[PDB]
Amino acid sequence: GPIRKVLLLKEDHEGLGISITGGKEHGVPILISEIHPGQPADRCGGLHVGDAILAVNGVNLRDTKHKEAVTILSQQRGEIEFEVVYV
């Protein structure tokens, strides 16, 4: 439905708490495939399986290979703004 902008807060050493799939080499968006219980995405809320990640902290993810999205997501620090839309 609507595009949402959601903030995730975590410690440097924590993971985001999401699994992603898709990517340019598969012809599909970066899609959230799992939200892991008790981890930052689950605690903060607003991110769900089936969301496409359009951008993370202002960085466009719409034409990234899978591993490029993994890299950009893995480089996040403590505050992370997600731009997502359920597809």
Binding site: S19, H26, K67, L73, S74
Partner: peptide
């Protein structure tokens, strides 16, 4: 193959 990568971050 056709299978998609899945990665936890």
């Amino acid at each position: 193959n056709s299978r998609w990568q899945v990665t936890r971050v």
